[PDB]
Design a protein around this ligand. Structure first.
Ligand SMILES: [Cl-]
Ligand SMILES: [Cl-]
Ligand SMILES: [Cl-]
Ligand SMILES: [Cl-]
Ligand SMILES: [Cl-]
Ligand SMILES: [Cl-]
Ligand SMILES: [Zn+2]
Ligand SMILES: [Zn+2]
Ligand SMILES: [Zn+2]
Ligand SMILES: [Zn+2]
Ligand SMILES: [Zn+2]
Ligand SMILES: [Zn+2]
Ligand SMILES: [Zn+2]
Ligand SMILES: [Zn+2]
Ligand SMILES: [Zn+2]
Ligand SMILES: [Zn+2]
Ligand SMILES: [Zn+2]
Ligand SMILES: [Zn+2]
Ligand SMILES: [Zn+2]
Ligand SMILES: [Zn+2]
Ligand SMILES: [Zn+2]
Lengths: 288, 288, 288, 288, 288, 288
């Protein structure tokens, strides 16, 4: 544009949902509170996420390219591009072309390869959607698959108990498809849950382990990856980012779980947003 | 819904714009950083605000009622409803019916009666749009007209120099149309700018005066009224809210004005969001 | 009174002691630092707590009703009423009548049923005092007995090792006498100490376990229950309140134990009061 | 006692009032929040201050010496002694003997010579009470008379407009009666109010001027002098103490004045207590 | 070196003085507290600054090149180079060669052209030292002359009252000798003091005006320019940097001036270092 | 000097190194950020510490007495004296005479008896240097030997596995040579590392255990002992000081270890300096 960004700008390719804490209504306040301008490229408008029984849904596939055409005319420079849940191969094509046209030598490209969970694909989707997400992540610097997504992206049978050595192998194989940094979430431990990561730079493998509370809050993945993104953009090391994001989520769940509560509403993000202002007093990351 | 809100919920009826800091991309991070869940009811999707030469525009008039129908099914309770720029009498009808159906005895209804500036109506609009905004504000507890909007809502010739006594009269006449609290922004002083307010409760009139820097940043009104809203929701007195919001804007402009900068991008909100965490050390409000 | 409380008001029925950190000289600064006005209804004036060899003592039993008669004339509304150590059945009668006359639909009534410790009644007291505290707690929403008090209130032989299942039973039986929330302090573990809680709402049982340092600081119970009270009044979940209060006490003891120190002076509260301003970075509560 | 104080201890000779923010219910939370243990020597127990139409009142004159006798047995060392409103010459005698017996080479003795306001003595009192307060302040290091009290202590006709030069003279004459530091509050300016001070050490005269809001909140003097005391105990210079205390009061009044409010309840202290944690960003003191 | 700096590194060319707060003992703690590693290249070792009657002095001219030769071998990359008081033309030669060898495309070079004050050269120095400082500043991006230094660097008769228009001219002429940013300190106003600045980028002129207290604290210039440097390195606009640095100094002087104090010891920096952690609540910069 | 210190002054006898974070470039910013003026008495000037392959080195042995002679003339009073790495018996003589001449009844004398590591003496040194450090520590209140230094100071064969009981014995024997407080660092545990301490006052033994990351950062000892010093000067108990300093180091290492990094540059101190502003939320000290 006219001048270099005074606040770094992050193109956020997620939906807008009216209720719940998912997608743009978590990405925007988190990354803005971490110092960054979030510029939404919305994929859809929903009354609420699809974990409620009903929802309104308006597909924005056709508007995406029109927004992008305008951003080109404005000559906006993005310091990062963060993609989340994409509805189709066509959206992957748009997003893929968007990254191609707007990337710069210093861009951070973060893709959450939203495909499935608990070993099954999300019901919307099939193996072609897996194939196209696999093509998209070749362009990414950082990806954040869950364990289900890891195996689908690798085209491997889902396995729920892998050794650390096997997980290291998996991380490395997925990193060979493009991404310098691969982060796997929701990896079981042996009460307890785990995040693993590999960085092609230095060939390092990291893990963070933390308590697991028996509650599912939709939007947890988008929250995680928003904190990873903002921590990395702030210049934090990979394992510090794992730690900040896992602790932040844990804090939010602790702030939420003690209430009689409808979990579909999400983590009570607003009660813990400003925790990110405090320095981490106890890290737990491990080099493996 | 199933339980009382643990984080107060605010229905935000504004557009989603990809670039600039306006509408939902300021309302969401501000009110979320102040402790409140923002539940967007988007009016339109834009690549960028209309102060740039071009913009994409997708009217969401037809989706609004579908989202609302779903919110009814979810039985969501809103602690506040905040409306901003509305595109048409039809949107006012939707919003008006929405307030009617979702209001509760403790709801705060805040309407920014976005109609014009510098004495002219925004070019989209005409006197019928003024007539319907006038019908809408009858349902509001707090409105935040600029000086242009004051005069149109009262159906009075624009006057750029009024006495304080005349402004008090104007405030009182507009409050008689419904709103307990009327806040007028961008009121010239005698280098310096002013906000005035009237509260039917106690029949009090307040003003805050602060420096004026020669720069227009689109989104300033939405920023102001987001801070007013969140301050009031936090339990602040009316004049404290005037002070917090005016100082917050002043801080943001000071953080922005010293750079070679394209003003259309907005105030550098992210550099000052956390100022709201600090207590005000110097108030300047006046009882008039 | 004339208007709704802008700062919530808490009637504090405790003694005033000149030295030590007990009763009103801990309740007042804690709850005031948490955002609440403490309105003392003093039960007695003492030079110092009774764990020193001597003390002055002035019984205020006869002044209590006179203060209350004036509060009625002022039409003060209390958002909470917190009772601590009461000297006699007559004080219980006064306090009981006070709660009856001043309670409102939203009042929080917190009673610390101060009766004994280490399995014996405090030496002042007998089984009639136990019977009248049992009548008083029927009116309370939250009680905080120690393990000795639990058993006396239930009219059960003291047992120092109970299973978690037995403690759950005890919690439930005591809750049946009135209190929605029963919190048991100083419950041995298996080096380590424990707090347990039951909430009739949702039928939930919680526990927090933390290190035990070998030192008794008089006023620890009043400190605990002041933090529980203020955390609950702030809108925290029950288990968060258990966590904040147990960590706060642990912090204070850690700040005190490393000095050559006369323990009767209490925890060095002033060195840790502002810890309560920070968000909890590590919770430890457990659902049982 | 057994060891040197790890938290400095301040004997506070003020009443305990159940409602309002005056005397011990402001002194205790303020000085405790500033890092200091407040050890109350209560002069009376009241349902509420005497600016309401009625109040209960229990004179503690006879208990004061009993408390002190116990404090002697405990060998408590006080780092400061702060006296406020005293009911009679007999209380002055007790307090005077208390200071004599408990003072140490480093003690700070602060006396607020509570006698009158708006040029008249408080109605309880007469010239003998003035004579005995004059004897008491000979033992003090810091006194905080209002302008009415200045003139009575000097045995001079009240004058409401004095020059700065005349006020300097007055300060110096009163300092000659004992006190190293004399602080005069509520000194009119020329909308605006003023505090003046003299320090015999360096022979310096200081003033702070700040806005005046038209509202009387009982307890303002006790609040002021509690902040002066704690600031001085923290090692602040005299003029910094004037600044912290005047700004703190101004902040509290600003937090209170915008509400429909019964002023007799006091400044909303709890909304601003933690302002004292922040460093002063703008001083206004003047050397005169 | 082996990797890019994780904490930006600033070569600081100043003396080390044992007592006083000047040179490296202010530069190091300030810039370190602002987020930056200070790598000292000491010019001399002194017991104390030369405003005391005596001082030890050890010239390090001969060691400077040896340190630099080692830094070359380590391949250290400096993000900024900040020079202060230089003792001779020979030191200017060393420093000048150092900047030449270690500058990179993004280096910030800050030179305080320490030459004189109150219209006279420092007594050590003559016009040849002025000529060589003039050669040095051609290599600088930011310089911070006082008004005396401005005139000497321009080779112009000292004038103590100049118009703003004349000062703008002076700023522009000095900027033509090399420096993009010229900051003049200690510019009289009309009780009050002023800082002016010019930025060749955008051709902007700024000023900040603040109170003047009658006290000279040696080290004030080094403190100022350390804050300017760190604020600019943090990405602040020029006028924000003027504001942060002037307010920081004002805060320190306010924290110091109220004590009986030996001014030669400097501003009580440690009492205000952490003020820099707080966001500026009131700016005062002016575009001229 | 003319007046008592308003900021406590600490004479720091360490070298000045241009690169790395060791000696004065860590001591100065740490203790200054903790509230204390650091007055350097430099022992040498180096381009960088001696763990790099080459370094410049300028011995300041001959300047030390000249600086001290000037400090005597200034009549500076030091509240603490902290010695680190000393190059020779001659420097020990200077430092020893300095402590003798400048000590006051309240001085804290802290000596880090820098002699060796991993069981060998630093290669510069021999048993005479051990003998003279042993003479120096007789004058110290607090010493911080590593395990290697413990054994040399006691003139005992190095043992890498000692029982806690044996370590207590060692602590006590070394304390008998003078120091009230002996702190041993880098004591192996049984992944994990340990600090032990003895205080002759109360005859107490303390230990803190924390994670061990496999990386050596030169300057870790100087960082530790700077935090111990400042924590003690702030009035913290011995075990709190052990905790603050060990956690601070752990935080810094965690902030550093996740990067590809040249360890010789030191812990990224600037990323964690302000952690010291936060209160410790989890202590781990143990009384043994
Ligand atoms: Cl630019
Ligand atoms: Cl509920
Ligand atoms: Cl009301
Ligand atoms: Cl002691
Ligand atoms: Cl690198
Ligand atoms: Cl002094
Ligand atoms: Zn394409
Ligand atoms: Zn996911
Ligand atoms: Zn309708
Ligand atoms: Zn507007
Ligand atoms: Zn924040
Ligand atoms: Zn009754
Ligand atoms: Zn108890
Ligand atoms: Zn007597
Ligand atoms: Zn008074
Ligand atoms: Zn606080
Ligand atoms: Zn050369
Ligand atoms: Zn200078
Ligand atoms: Zn800080
Ligand atoms: Zn000698
Ligand atoms: Zn060492």
């Amino acid at each position: 544009g006219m001048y270099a960004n005074k606040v770094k700008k992050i193109a956020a390719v997620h939906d807008l949902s009216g209720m719940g804490r998912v997608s743009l209504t978590v990405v925007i306040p988190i990354l803005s509170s971490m110092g960054f301008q979030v510029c939404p490229l919305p994929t859809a408008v929903l009354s609420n996420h699809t974990q409620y029984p009903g929802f309104s849904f308006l597909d924005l596939t056709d508007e995406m390219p029109k927004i992008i055409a305008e951003w080109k005319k404005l000559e906006v420079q993005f310091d990062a591009i963060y993609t989340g849940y994409l509805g189709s191969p066509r959206q992957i094509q748009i997003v893929s072309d968007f990254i191609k046209d707007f990337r710069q030598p210093d861009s951070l490209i973060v893709a959450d390869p939203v495909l499935g969970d608990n070993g099954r694909l999300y019901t919307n989707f099939d193996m072609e959607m897996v194939k196209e997400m696999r093509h998209l992540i070749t362009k990414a610097d950082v990806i954040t698959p869950n364990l289900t997504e890891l195996f689908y992206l690798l085209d491997e049978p889902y396995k729920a108990d892998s050794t650390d050595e096997e997980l290291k192998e998996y991380l490395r194989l997925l990193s060979d498809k493009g991404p310098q940094v691969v982060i796997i979430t929701s990896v079981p431990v042996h009460h307890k849950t785990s995040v693993y990561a590999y960085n092609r730079q230095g060939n390092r493998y990291w893990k963070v382990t933390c308590p697991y509370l028996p509650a599912h809050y939709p939007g947890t993945g988008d929250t995680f990856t928003s904190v990873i993104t903002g921590s990395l953009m702030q210049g934090d090391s990979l394992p510090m980012a794992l730690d900040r994001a896992t602790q932040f989520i844990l804090q939010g769940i602790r702030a939420t779980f003690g209430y009689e509560y409808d979990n579909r509403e999400g983590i009570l993000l607003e009660k813990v947003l400003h925790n990110l202002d405090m320095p981490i007093q106890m890290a737990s990351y491990e080099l493996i």
